Amino acid sequence: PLESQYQVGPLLGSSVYSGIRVSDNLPVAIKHVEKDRISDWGELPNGTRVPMEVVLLKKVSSGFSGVIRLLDWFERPDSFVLILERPEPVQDLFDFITERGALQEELARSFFWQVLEAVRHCHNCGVLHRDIKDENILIDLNRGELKLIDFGSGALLKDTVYTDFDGTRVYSPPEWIRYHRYHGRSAAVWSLGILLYDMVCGDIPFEHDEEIIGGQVFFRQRVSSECQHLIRWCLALRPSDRPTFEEIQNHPWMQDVLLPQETAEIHLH
């Protein structure tokens, strides 16, 4: 019972539909994925061959966190359908930055901190997202909580080298651009530096390969010296020179973060 358990509404993007669970009127998002277009396949704790996205979502689904929750899924002849919990009201972080421009550092701090906690949660669950970007972050405008979405480019986390990548190139690290190789955590930290710059400057720093490998970060907005330092550290050209997640969260710019509800009341309501 798939069409009987959810009322399907309008297209949110692409193929993802707004919907409501009939059992309790819970807002959901209904994501359809064509079998023919699936890159990596995995097996569930049952041996059922499913899209890796499903595997990764079940591994991070445990509990409450800043990660989108997979509520259910179904297999169809030519597709899989994914049922995700949908915040309401919501805006994704790309549209938010487009409308607001560069974010006040207090707000960027709260947002960036929540993305850090969410990505730590992924890594604790054995999952590498591989496509951190403002487009893949939802803001619950009433609760002030961020949610990481779209694990369609993710992978199981491992300590050895990755040689495949299907995320967003302008958030990919120079070792991928130059050598088509990267390690998971240090590549994640690079994308987080791109995201932090995006937040405090109003757009990402690099559009072209030469910029990505060039190692120069120009600040187009007024940005505090502490924040600039964190960004430049996350964007170190050598992966081993980048900070760990713990070093990011202990950085002086990251202290005295607002709680989510404070964030909503001060900046979103």
Add this chain to the structure above:
Amino acid sequence: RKRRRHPS
């Protein structure tokens, strides 16, 4: 310059 989304 123009701000734009980037595909995966």
